[PDB]
Amino acid sequence: GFQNLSEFVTLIVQAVTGAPGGLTDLQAFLTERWGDLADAFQAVANLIDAIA
Amino acid sequence: GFQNLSEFVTLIVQAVTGAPGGLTDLQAFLTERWGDLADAFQAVANLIDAIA
């Protein structure tokens, strides 16, 4: 249902990320999400360390 | 701007995952990340239980 591949890329970006944009925007949002997830994992590890 | 769908697939995999590769590589990286995320959530539950 796509006229071209560019709008399909935008649709993929909108499906996997809230903010519409290009493939670079998709990569940036996913990188920020993975960084935040790593920060949360390290926070859990620090909670381990505080309990210990 | 993509030459072909295979190149576009490689670009999608590179944007969503650090390691370049095919759709199978994308699925593998995302599945191991799902396993890591599930382990983190079970760690959070285990900390609930440890405080309890």
Determined by cryo-EM
Resolution in A: 3.0
Q: Which residue of A has its CA nearest to B11?
A: A23
What angle (nearest 5°) sits at the alpha carbon of residue B30, between those of residues A32 and A9? Answer: 65
> Rounded to whole angstroms, how far apart are CA atoms B52 and B49?
5
Rounded to a whole number of angstroms, the distance from the CA of B28 to the nearest CA of chain A is 16
Interface of A with B in 5-44 (CB under 8 A): 5-6, 9, 12, 16, 23-24, 26-27, 30, 34, 37, 40-41, 44
Question: What distances in angstroms separate CA A51 from CA A18, A23, A36, A48, one per listed residue?
Answer: 36, 42, 22, 5
The DSSP line for A1-52 is: --SSHHHHHHHHHHHH-SS---HHHHHHHHHHHHHHHHHHHHHHHHHHHHH-
Range list of β-strands (E), chain B: none
* Nearest C-alpha neighbor of B24 from the set B10, B36, B35: B10
| End-to-end Cα separation, chain A, in angstroms | 56
